[PDB]
């Protein structure tokens, strides 16, 4: 007999890591593949962070640590939230985790009960619904359009809330759209959320530093009165090109943070001790390397957006930040008679070798997520191929 | 209003990491504290493993990897299981995780349904019941005595099994007793397990290399016919003094391993990329550093066991391996009128500064777990203090 799988894992299907595995596979066969599906910076970890990790290895920092992070890193997080976000957190409000993904997963396991509804704006990071489902929560998707710049409004939010709603993910700047809410937009959402006090607000600020159209702002900057029911989710993966090291961090209400620490203490223990020391050097160091990387993404974005605009049948909303852009190819799908954006993306990959992620993976049919965390020369080639495929 | 906690997290209370935090705290106040509660080797990570990690950092191995491990590490695990354990696994049967704790936690989340019973022999590693409870499983504890050398027998196992039993943890050599089953003992347990085919066998071989009284053997060496319903859990934390790096690995039935990979893909993504490269160097390198460390634990064990034997009111069963020994202080508790082994351990810490873990944390009242992952000079001091306290 085959080993049966738990009912909870039968609820879930990760297509971003799956495209990555298919792209690596077809490159392994020797084919001419350009990967526009990546979810990490192409830049290496900055040298001063690498040097701090090497110093930690040489010093023998190879042991278990406090589950929620060495005190130097919890302090660096505390100071970062004050310095960058004008938010005051005590050490017992801070949890360092194995990537920001684990912050989110620990949150769901520490907080959500079976049947609880979680508002997830589309387009959404692929993992939000699956993490909710693994806690037996119920994803409640709010669909958005380009005319709304892929952002929910206060009337959509109120309409989606029920007496069963206990959480919302607010991810700004967004994976996959690259769009960020303005402070006033967050204020209008906060005014709705103030009317529903059982809703915990999970603000996923992972892409905070990767923004150029406006200064970063989150729900607590807009609505300080929501502090006691908000958890702030962040990490070093994107700002410091540290995706492989797996360090995220969160700040929020002490009882919730302690419950998340309890989940973590029974699942991973502390994150890698060397990675923790690397993250101290990142958070306490200069922003110079951040600015270098964000400037690169900005110039690449403007190039890609211009190329997409010029391709007949592709409609695009320019991003505010991140290394993603999220154009609609629905007109190409319709003129070709493709079934959907999965067929579009499979045909594109097999015809011209460009790998990207179908918009339906993020809950928005007919779009595609293009990542420009690759060199501008590779982007010129890839957009040439996309233009030829769509011609 | 305080943020409420999920019902699942209200089910759980980690006391090994808690003693560690209290010991570090009292040392911080400047007090004369000896920590005999540690759960990791005192030796640093071997130099050749450190050098491989540094080489990976310098090479820019700082990106996301396959969630279940880079192919070089999955291959090293495959070869390790064949070389050490005469077990044949394909790559799709292997999962690298964030510590062996995450292997165990992923297993529970991928496999256990609410109400499923899990047999957990006492004394048990503190995390087994809590990981089961977080999947809404039901821990079913089998209590053992020193006259049984803290090992279950086939009649106890059969009596504990019900139609609801779907899993058993078999941890040999044991945390906290240090005792290992013989091959024939595992054969007798396997004969019971063959009569109950819905029971998945989770053999936690983390302490495999840290053994001296007999060659290591597990349930599949004893009973090869259980291969299709056994998951083998192991890791580099103990054998290579790598606890801070967080690399575990497991091998078992492909559908189950894939479901565990699904949980991992929605919780942590891949383990730290640098740590994965370090683990490749460990598994593919010489056993010389393992033997050096295990020889040290062996000589320290024999010293500690002899000192414990000489203290009136302490009864001890010598360990077969690990860096733990698990004597009973019940006679001290009774002559003093202490309430239990928690009171014993608190009084010992406050009177003479020796920190250790009460046996009730592992489900065996009246014992204490002493770790000898510290230098022999510190052990002489600590045992002197214990002798004075117990006098
Ligand atoms: C919106 C969002 N949140 C969180 C994460 C988690 O990233 P990591 O687990 O590498 O910290 C990601 C992925 O990069 C993301 O896109
Ligand atoms: C019995 C047992 N299994 C698994 C583990 C997991 O160790 P780690 O998560 O560091 O790999 C431990 C702790 O060291 C343990 O004692």
mmCIF file of C-alpha atoms in Angstrom, chain A residues 17-207:
data_model
loop_
_atom_site.group_PDB
_atom_site.id
_atom_site.type_symbol
_atom_site.label_atom_id
_atom_site.label_comp_id
_atom_site.label_asym_id
_atom_site.label_seq_id
_atom_site.Cartn_x
_atom_site.Cartn_y
_atom_site.Cartn_z
ATOM 1 C CA UNK A 17 9.727 27.248 -7.257
ATOM 2 C CA UNK A 18 8.330 24.831 -9.873
ATOM 3 C CA UNK A 19 9.068 27.136 -12.826
ATOM 4 C CA UNK A 20 12.541 27.544 -11.318
ATOM 5 C CA UNK A 21 13.030 23.764 -11.316
ATOM 6 C CA UNK A 22 11.782 23.419 -14.902
ATOM 7 C CA UNK A 23 14.040 26.262 -16.082
ATOM 8 C CA UNK A 24 17.102 24.749 -14.390
ATOM 9 C CA UNK A 25 16.161 21.402 -15.930
ATOM 10 C CA UNK A 26 15.865 22.639 -19.533
ATOM 11 C CA UNK A 27 19.106 24.597 -19.138
ATOM 12 C CA UNK A 28 20.673 21.317 -17.995
ATOM 13 C CA UNK A 29 19.633 19.692 -21.292
ATOM 14 C CA UNK A 30 21.686 22.358 -23.059
ATOM 15 C CA UNK A 31 18.779 24.387 -24.437
ATOM 16 C CA UNK A 32 18.820 28.168 -24.961
ATOM 17 C CA UNK A 33 16.730 29.228 -21.949
ATOM 18 C CA UNK A 34 16.340 32.687 -20.409
ATOM 19 C CA UNK A 35 14.828 32.615 -16.943
ATOM 20 C CA UNK A 36 12.456 35.517 -16.313
ATOM 21 C CA UNK A 37 10.729 33.652 -13.485
ATOM 22 C CA UNK A 38 13.298 34.253 -10.746
ATOM 23 C CA UNK A 39 12.237 35.371 -7.286
ATOM 24 C CA UNK A 40 15.586 36.645 -6.015
ATOM 25 C CA UNK A 41 18.135 39.345 -6.871
ATOM 26 C CA UNK A 42 20.816 38.422 -9.378
ATOM 27 C CA UNK A 43 23.400 40.352 -7.332
ATOM 28 C CA UNK A 44 25.500 38.351 -4.868
ATOM 29 C CA UNK A 45 25.355 38.996 -1.140
ATOM 30 C CA UNK A 46 27.324 42.217 -0.421
ATOM 31 C CA UNK A 47 30.960 41.630 0.528
ATOM 32 C CA UNK A 48 30.748 43.119 4.028
ATOM 33 C CA UNK A 49 27.948 40.685 4.877
ATOM 34 C CA UNK A 50 29.939 37.760 3.457
ATOM 35 C CA UNK A 51 32.944 38.804 5.545
ATOM 36 C CA UNK A 52 30.822 38.856 8.704
ATOM 37 C CA UNK A 53 29.586 35.347 7.939
ATOM 38 C CA UNK A 54 33.125 34.096 7.367
ATOM 39 C CA UNK A 55 34.259 35.732 10.625
ATOM 40 C CA UNK A 56 31.429 33.943 12.454
ATOM 41 C CA UNK A 57 32.471 30.594 10.959
ATOM 42 C CA UNK A 58 36.076 31.153 11.996
ATOM 43 C CA UNK A 59 34.968 32.167 15.497
ATOM 44 C CA UNK A 60 33.014 28.927 15.990
ATOM 45 C CA UNK A 61 29.515 30.462 15.936
ATOM 46 C CA UNK A 62 28.193 27.030 14.993
ATOM 47 C CA UNK A 63 25.877 26.248 17.941
ATOM 48 C CA UNK A 64 22.211 26.462 18.791
ATOM 49 C CA UNK A 65 21.125 30.006 19.615
ATOM 50 C CA UNK A 66 18.008 31.444 21.191
ATOM 51 C CA UNK A 67 15.188 30.104 19.025
ATOM 52 C CA UNK A 68 13.966 33.621 18.216
ATOM 53 C CA UNK A 69 17.411 34.999 17.299
ATOM 54 C CA UNK A 70 20.699 36.019 18.900
ATOM 55 C CA UNK A 71 20.315 39.191 20.927
ATOM 56 C CA UNK A 72 22.519 41.188 18.527
ATOM 57 C CA UNK A 73 20.116 40.382 15.699
ATOM 58 C CA UNK A 74 16.931 41.016 17.677
ATOM 59 C CA UNK A 75 18.456 44.365 18.685
ATOM 60 C CA UNK A 76 19.379 45.138 15.066
ATOM 61 C CA UNK A 77 15.775 44.417 14.061
ATOM 62 C CA UNK A 78 14.443 46.627 16.859
ATOM 63 C CA UNK A 79 16.689 49.479 15.731
ATOM 64 C CA UNK A 80 15.793 48.922 12.065
ATOM 65 C CA UNK A 81 12.062 49.236 12.746
ATOM 66 C CA UNK A 82 12.621 52.480 14.666
ATOM 67 C CA UNK A 83 15.113 53.957 12.195
ATOM 68 C CA UNK A 84 13.316 53.004 8.947
ATOM 69 C CA UNK A 85 9.652 52.746 9.925
ATOM 70 C CA UNK A 86 9.270 54.902 13.073
ATOM 71 C CA UNK A 87 7.902 51.866 14.917
ATOM 72 C CA UNK A 88 8.704 51.018 18.547
ATOM 73 C CA UNK A 89 9.059 47.324 19.436
ATOM 74 C CA UNK A 90 10.463 45.619 22.512
ATOM 75 C CA UNK A 91 12.663 42.545 22.260
ATOM 76 C CA UNK A 92 9.770 40.321 23.345
ATOM 77 C CA UNK A 93 7.858 41.569 20.278
ATOM 78 C CA UNK A 94 10.485 40.376 17.762
ATOM 79 C CA UNK A 95 10.995 36.950 16.173
ATOM 80 C CA UNK A 96 13.781 35.987 13.754
ATOM 81 C CA UNK A 97 12.736 33.082 11.498
ATOM 82 C CA UNK A 98 13.986 30.845 8.655
ATOM 83 C CA UNK A 99 13.128 33.275 5.889
ATOM 84 C CA UNK A 100 10.137 35.568 5.735
ATOM 85 C CA UNK A 101 8.211 32.560 4.439
ATOM 86 C CA UNK A 102 8.613 30.998 7.884
ATOM 87 C CA UNK A 103 7.459 34.207 9.565
ATOM 88 C CA UNK A 104 4.262 33.924 7.517
ATOM 89 C CA UNK A 105 3.873 30.178 8.059
ATOM 90 C CA UNK A 106 4.515 30.457 11.817
ATOM 91 C CA UNK A 107 1.918 33.238 11.952
ATOM 92 C CA UNK A 108 -0.739 31.073 10.302
ATOM 93 C CA UNK A 109 0.013 28.123 12.584
ATOM 94 C CA UNK A 110 0.150 30.288 15.732
ATOM 95 C CA UNK A 111 -3.045 32.241 15.021
ATOM 96 C CA UNK A 112 -5.510 30.697 12.537
ATOM 97 C CA UNK A 113 -8.159 28.150 13.555
ATOM 98 C CA UNK A 114 -9.996 25.835 11.155
ATOM 99 C CA UNK A 115 -12.606 27.788 9.238
ATOM 100 C CA UNK A 116 -11.108 31.232 9.860
ATOM 101 C CA UNK A 117 -11.298 33.435 6.763
ATOM 102 C CA UNK A 118 -8.205 35.285 5.567
ATOM 103 C CA UNK A 119 -8.469 38.128 3.078
ATOM 104 C CA UNK A 120 -5.854 37.729 0.338
ATOM 105 C CA UNK A 121 -5.805 40.456 -2.325
ATOM 106 C CA UNK A 122 -5.135 39.195 -5.874
ATOM 107 C CA UNK A 123 -2.635 39.197 -7.427
ATOM 108 C CA UNK A 124 -1.116 37.436 -4.438
ATOM 109 C CA UNK A 125 2.208 35.856 -3.645
ATOM 110 C CA UNK A 126 1.626 32.186 -4.438
ATOM 111 C CA UNK A 127 2.288 31.004 -0.890
ATOM 112 C CA UNK A 128 -0.347 33.055 0.957
ATOM 113 C CA UNK A 129 -3.363 30.799 0.180
ATOM 114 C CA UNK A 130 -1.410 27.597 0.708
ATOM 115 C CA UNK A 131 -0.048 28.720 4.094
ATOM 116 C CA UNK A 132 -3.594 29.640 5.130
ATOM 117 C CA UNK A 133 -4.943 26.292 3.930
ATOM 118 C CA UNK A 134 -2.287 24.379 5.881
ATOM 119 C CA UNK A 135 -3.729 25.978 9.048
ATOM 120 C CA UNK A 136 -7.221 24.987 7.792
ATOM 121 C CA UNK A 137 -8.007 28.632 7.166
ATOM 122 C CA UNK A 138 -10.187 29.750 4.265
ATOM 123 C CA UNK A 139 -8.595 32.043 1.650
ATOM 124 C CA UNK A 140 -10.947 34.839 0.589
ATOM 125 C CA UNK A 141 -9.545 36.388 -2.606
ATOM 126 C CA UNK A 142 -10.297 39.947 -3.699
ATOM 127 C CA UNK A 143 -9.722 40.210 -7.439
ATOM 128 C CA UNK A 144 -8.288 43.443 -8.871
ATOM 129 C CA UNK A 145 -7.853 44.891 -12.362
ATOM 130 C CA UNK A 146 -5.272 47.103 -14.124
ATOM 131 C CA UNK A 147 -7.757 49.989 -13.947
ATOM 132 C CA UNK A 148 -7.315 49.735 -10.167
ATOM 133 C CA UNK A 149 -3.527 49.343 -10.608
ATOM 134 C CA UNK A 150 -4.028 45.884 -9.057
ATOM 135 C CA UNK A 151 -4.925 47.389 -5.663
ATOM 136 C CA UNK A 152 -8.035 46.744 -3.598
ATOM 137 C CA UNK A 153 -10.291 49.584 -2.514
ATOM 138 C CA UNK A 154 -12.163 50.109 0.735
ATOM 139 C CA UNK A 155 -15.503 49.010 -0.703
ATOM 140 C CA UNK A 156 -14.082 45.711 -1.958
ATOM 141 C CA UNK A 157 -12.484 45.135 1.438
ATOM 142 C CA UNK A 158 -15.666 45.793 3.401
ATOM 143 C CA UNK A 159 -17.665 43.569 1.062
ATOM 144 C CA UNK A 160 -15.218 40.669 1.453
ATOM 145 C CA UNK A 161 -15.159 40.816 5.275
ATOM 146 C CA UNK A 162 -17.505 38.462 7.152
ATOM 147 C CA UNK A 163 -17.879 37.554 10.837
ATOM 148 C CA UNK A 164 -15.423 34.740 10.064
ATOM 149 C CA UNK A 165 -12.620 37.023 8.847
ATOM 150 C CA UNK A 166 -9.682 36.977 11.249
ATOM 151 C CA UNK A 167 -6.693 38.067 9.155
ATOM 152 C CA UNK A 168 -5.589 39.977 6.063
ATOM 153 C CA UNK A 169 -2.296 39.919 4.181
ATOM 154 C CA UNK A 170 -1.231 43.373 2.933
ATOM 155 C CA UNK A 171 1.838 43.015 0.687
ATOM 156 C CA UNK A 172 3.175 46.363 -0.536
ATOM 157 C CA UNK A 173 5.238 46.643 -2.721
ATOM 158 C CA UNK A 174 3.581 43.561 -4.195
ATOM 159 C CA UNK A 175 4.842 40.269 -5.431
ATOM 160 C CA UNK A 176 3.875 39.893 -8.338
ATOM 161 C CA UNK A 177 2.586 43.276 -9.507
ATOM 162 C CA UNK A 178 5.406 45.506 -8.244
ATOM 163 C CA UNK A 179 2.742 48.039 -7.187
ATOM 164 C CA UNK A 180 2.687 49.845 -3.828
ATOM 165 C CA UNK A 181 -0.193 51.456 -1.954
ATOM 166 C CA UNK A 182 0.060 55.160 -1.172
ATOM 167 C CA UNK A 183 -0.240 56.257 2.440
ATOM 168 C CA UNK A 184 -3.745 57.595 1.813
ATOM 169 C CA UNK A 185 -4.833 54.331 0.188
ATOM 170 C CA UNK A 186 -3.613 52.477 3.279
ATOM 171 C CA UNK A 187 -5.458 55.008 5.447
ATOM 172 C CA UNK A 188 -8.706 54.211 3.628
ATOM 173 C CA UNK A 189 -8.136 50.486 4.091
ATOM 174 C CA UNK A 190 -7.271 51.082 7.742
ATOM 175 C CA UNK A 191 -10.571 52.893 8.273
ATOM 176 C CA UNK A 192 -12.375 49.742 7.140
ATOM 177 C CA UNK A 193 -10.147 47.523 9.271
ATOM 178 C CA UNK A 194 -10.838 49.673 12.340
ATOM 179 C CA UNK A 195 -14.503 48.622 11.989
ATOM 180 C CA UNK A 196 -13.600 44.902 12.257
ATOM 181 C CA UNK A 197 -11.455 44.423 15.370
ATOM 182 C CA UNK A 198 -11.081 40.668 15.134
ATOM 183 C CA UNK A 199 -8.954 41.031 11.951
ATOM 184 C CA UNK A 200 -5.223 40.739 12.560
ATOM 185 C CA UNK A 201 -3.302 42.725 9.942
ATOM 186 C CA UNK A 202 -0.219 40.988 8.519
ATOM 187 C CA UNK A 203 1.786 43.579 6.574
ATOM 188 C CA UNK A 204 4.396 41.841 4.417
ATOM 189 C CA UNK A 205 7.052 44.513 3.959
ATOM 190 C CA UNK A 206 9.666 42.165 2.411
ATOM 191 C CA UNK A 207 10.164 44.478 -0.596
#
